[PDB]
């Protein structure tokens, strides 16, 4: 039965009293004066009362109240009565902008009863309790306002200029008379032709913020509706910003939409836009030692050393992508959104480290084997079931060579390296692809470009049957193929040999 | 290719190395299938006819193929785009999407009831005034990806590379673009002072890329060599190098800033505010040509001034 | 109390995306400013490095 009141800047939300002080002289302030402070509204401050009186009211004049129109009329008549030739005809937004500007620049810090609106310490209290009333979005907008406007002026102005500005804030005749005695204070003041670089610096910073905040949602919409029609390389070519800048804009916009809505962010998006960069750059780093970067993955011979290696590189680059994304043909095996969240989430560093070249899948299908009969029967049926998985791999003369590794893990090879895994429930199954590759030397590279269905096949790549007939494979000159075919076929005919004679169906005598 | 084989076969002319490089780079730059298969045929024709194969040609072949990978990928993605368009036009006519729109599994298995019937935890709904709620509403309520363009581009590519197709697709999605053409593009490669500041010291903004308030690059509050004073001093030294480049004529003269105007002599501020001058060169034209201005002190444009041309240019 | 002392004196925060090297290198298209460091390491190692 409670209605939560809507909170905004006009009536601020009440906060706790254990909050840290944003400003520096309030951190070392004694706590007796902290308890002396009363919880008043924001306009009860004299600086807040001034800002509500002359600045916020003139911005409230933009609406369609009748008092707004009458104040607009008397303000037009007032600044026409000031001088006629300078502001002959301009709109009401222009006249309230002009009076807002003139009331902003005429602000001084003295005593409240001496004719001045507020003191300096009241302004510092307003800044402190204004920064305390901000969340992280408000602090982000405050830092953005610092970067857009105050940062170029601080980058251009000298420290004697900000000392002069501090003396203008404090408005003390003693400190101004003390600083006017210094020759180095008066002579080292900044010149306006050097100060005019602040406009170009401010324009460049606001241009970068216009790249971020104004071009950002358009790129986000164009990439999020149809990414196969507008990929990031197409957007980077048609807008001309950069490739990594466009991808950073997309990642920052999705994480900003997630963080501002109190939603856990989709962590798979930097894995999807920076996939090659995630495999290349992101490493686990220890504390007390420095690391390097591998220039190449392998010690190899260059492709410029021979014409055939050059032609092989050019033919592989034509059969390759330039940038692969989540929607391309190598990622077309992700037919389920559960597989989509499994591959890009929490196991992408394991899924990409399975096979170096990108294939139509990630591993190999698992098949199980038959158990040989145990002639003791149920006396020994319990003994194969155990606690752990028992993995067995083959070795020997034919088996265990890494140079034929992708030949020894080839399921279309009759002399494949035999693996078995007995499960704790007694099941004999084959090994997975990473399980078969774990028994060899480590292969820690990945190919992110070449896709083998894009290979050329019509002009120069024409494998001929006469080249395979040059080896002259014959069945009469060698009987090993027919012997393996005899070893493959079942031998059930040997028991019904006497039961040219050819095998026929059983003839029935009940129906005949 | 027609003029190439007409030059070779009919007129019996031996082609030069440059026109072999042209037929190599034309098939390389074209993203159609088999372009490099014909570029290697032109390379073989250069090899077996005594035409010189330079290493710069090989490096340019690798660079041009890596650059035309974008065109190759666009012409490969347009085929899947056309396949998805045909499948969408089939399945919206047969009516499978009307049967798939009804969430019978969500109606039987509710969001708060699991498969057995216990009560499960559901996340609270986000505010509809947020950005993410509007983004998922724009994902659900707008038109499909297959209804944006009926035909594809003229040369193998999907539509949307130009700005007219981009603006039309944004109109179909209910978005009026703030940047209609390429002159309303901010173009960060034109910046000269800002990459010079970013290269030596670091990012002058800091809070340009900040997710939750921890990715910001700012100097420390303790002071010393990492404090604000040394960083602002070094940024002022880099701005002083840029201003020395301005003074010697390598860079154009900057316009009048509010910080520059507020420190000036008050009579110069009066002349600027009555003239409307943006650059101090316009202020120098306002002072050195008093017969040019209007009656309210306003500055006349450039086209209303004509200098005296001497007769000694007729020699 | 035995967990309050053992802090993270072993690990460090990971490399961000598009990060640079501790020697100052970076993976750009132009590797003229980047250098190799295979010649600074010892010539022979007793065992096998993880790289």
């Amino acid at each position: 039965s409670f209605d939560a009141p809507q909170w905004d800047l006009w009536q601020s939300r009440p906060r706790s009293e254990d909050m840290d002080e944003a400003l520096q002289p309030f951190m070392d302030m004694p706590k007796s004066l902290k308890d002396r402070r009363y919880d008043i509204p924001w306009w009860a401050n004299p600086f807040g009362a001034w800002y509500l009186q002359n600045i916020l009211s003139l911005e409230l004049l933009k609406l369609k109240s009748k008092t707004n129109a009458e104040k607009i009329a008397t303000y037009r008549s007032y600044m026409r009565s000031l001088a006629s030739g300078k502001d002959n005809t301009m709109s009401d937004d222009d006249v309230i902008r002009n009076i807002i500007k003139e009331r902003w620049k005429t602000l001084e810090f003295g005593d409240r009863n001496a004719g001045y609106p507020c003191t300096f310490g009241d302004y510092i209290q307003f800044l402190n309790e204004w920064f305390k009333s901000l969340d992280e979005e408000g602090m982000q907008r405050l830092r953005e306002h610092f970067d857009r406007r105050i940062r170029p002026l601080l980058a251009v102005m000298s420290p004697v200029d900000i000392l002069w500005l501090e003396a203008l804030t404090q408005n003390s005749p003693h400190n101004k008379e003390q600083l006017q005695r210094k020759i180095a204070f008066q002579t080292s003041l900044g010149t306006p032709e050097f100060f005019d670089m602040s406009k170009r610096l401010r324009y460049e910073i606001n241009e970068d913020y216009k790249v971020r905040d104004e071009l950002g949602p358009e790129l986000f919409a164009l990439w999020s509706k149809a990414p196969e029609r507008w990929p990031p390389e197409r957007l980077s070519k048609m807008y001309g910003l950069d490739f990594t800048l466009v991808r950073k804009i997309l990642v920052w916009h999705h994480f900003k939409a997630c963080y501002d809505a109190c939603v856990e962010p989709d962590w798979s998006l930097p894995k999807r836009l920076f996939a090659l960069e995630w495999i290349r750059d992101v490493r686990a780093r220890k504390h007390g030692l420095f690391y390097g970067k591998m220039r190449f993955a392998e010690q190899k011979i260059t492709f410029y050393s021979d014409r055939f290696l050059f032609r092989d590189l050019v033919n592989r680059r034509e059969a390759s992508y330039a940038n692969v994304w989540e929607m391309d043909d190598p990622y077309r095996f992700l037919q389920t959104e559960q597989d989509y969240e499994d591959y890009w989430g929490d196991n992408y560093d394991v899924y990409r480290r399975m096979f170096p070249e990108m294939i139509g899948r990630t591993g190999e299908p698992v098949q199980q084997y038959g158990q040989m009969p145990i002639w003791a029967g149920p006396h020994r049926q319990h003994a194969n079931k155990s606690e752990h998985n028992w993995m067995f791999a083959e070795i020997g003369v034919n088996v265990g060579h890494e140079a034929l590794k992708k030949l020894e893990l080839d399921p279309t090879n009759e002399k494949r390296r035999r693996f078995v895994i007995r499960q704790p429930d007694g099941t004999l199954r084959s090994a997975k692809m990473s399980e078969m590759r774990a028994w060899y030397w480590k292969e820690e590279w990945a190919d992110f470009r070449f896709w083998a269905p894009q290979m050329e096949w019509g002009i120069e790549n024409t494998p001929s049957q006469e080249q395979y007939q040059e080896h002259v494979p014959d069945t009469t000159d060698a009987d090993f193929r027919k012997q393996r075919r005899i070893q493959s076929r079942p031998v059930k005919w040997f028991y019904e040999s006497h039961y040219e004679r050819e095998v026929r169906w059983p003839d029935v005598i009940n129906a005949a | 290719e027609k003029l190439f084989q007409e030059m070779i076969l009919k007129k019996d002319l031996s082609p030069s190395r440059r026109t072999y490089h042209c037929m190599i780079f034309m098939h390389l730059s074209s993203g159609e299938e088999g372009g490099t298969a014909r570029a290697l045929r032109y390379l073989e024709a250069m090899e077996r006819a005594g035409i010189q194969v330079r290493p710069s040609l090989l490096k340019k072949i690798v660079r041009v193929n890596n650059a035309a990978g974008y065109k190759r990928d666009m012409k490969r993605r347009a085929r899947r785009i056309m396949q998805a368009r045909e499948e969408y036009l089939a399945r919206k006519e047969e009516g499978v999407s009307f049967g798939e729109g009804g969430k019978e599994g969500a109606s039987n298995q509710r969001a708060d009831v699991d498969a057995e019937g216990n009560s499960i935890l559901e996340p609270l709904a986000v505010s509809p005034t947020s950005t993410l709620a509007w983004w998922e509403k724009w994902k659900r309520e707008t038109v499909s990806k297959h209804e944006l363009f009926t035909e594809e581009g003229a040369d193998g590519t999907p539509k949307g590379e130009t700005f007219e197709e981009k603006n039309e697709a944004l109109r179909m999605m209910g978005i009026t673009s703030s940047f209609q053409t390429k002159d309303l593009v901010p173009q960060p490669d034109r910046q000269k002072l800002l990459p010079l500041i970013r290269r030596e010291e670091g990012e002058i903004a800091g809070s340009l890329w900040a997710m939750d308030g921890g990715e910001l690059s700012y100097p420390k509050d303790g002071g010393g060599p990492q404090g604000w004073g040394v960083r602002l001093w070094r940024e002022r030294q880099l701005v002083k190098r840029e201003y020395q480049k301005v003074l010697d004529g390598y860079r154009p003269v900057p316009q009048l800033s509010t910080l520059g105007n507020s420190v000036r002599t008050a009579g110069d501020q009066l002349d600027i505010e009555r003239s409307g001058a943006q650059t101090p060169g316009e202020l120098s034209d306002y002072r050195n040509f008093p017969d040019n201005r209007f009656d309210g002190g306003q500055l006349k444009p450039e086209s209303e001034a004509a200098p005296a041309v001497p007769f000694s240019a007729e020699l | 109390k035995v967990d309050s002392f053992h802090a993270n004196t072993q690990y460090q925060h990971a490399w961000p995306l598009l990060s640079h090297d501790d020697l100052g290198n970076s993976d750009q298209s132009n590797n003229t400013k980047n250098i190799m460091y295979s010649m600074y390491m010892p010539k022979r190692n007793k065992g096998t490095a993880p790289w």
Binding site: Q24, W104, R143, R149, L153, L165 | - | -
Partner: peptide, 30 residues
Amino acid sequence: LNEAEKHHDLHMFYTLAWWKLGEGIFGVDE
């Protein structure tokens, strides 16, 4: 260990009178 700073010198720059020089900085940009 080490404490990540909240950058409290961001707020000390707002104590200066930027309205006197920047001619109405604290409002919206024109």
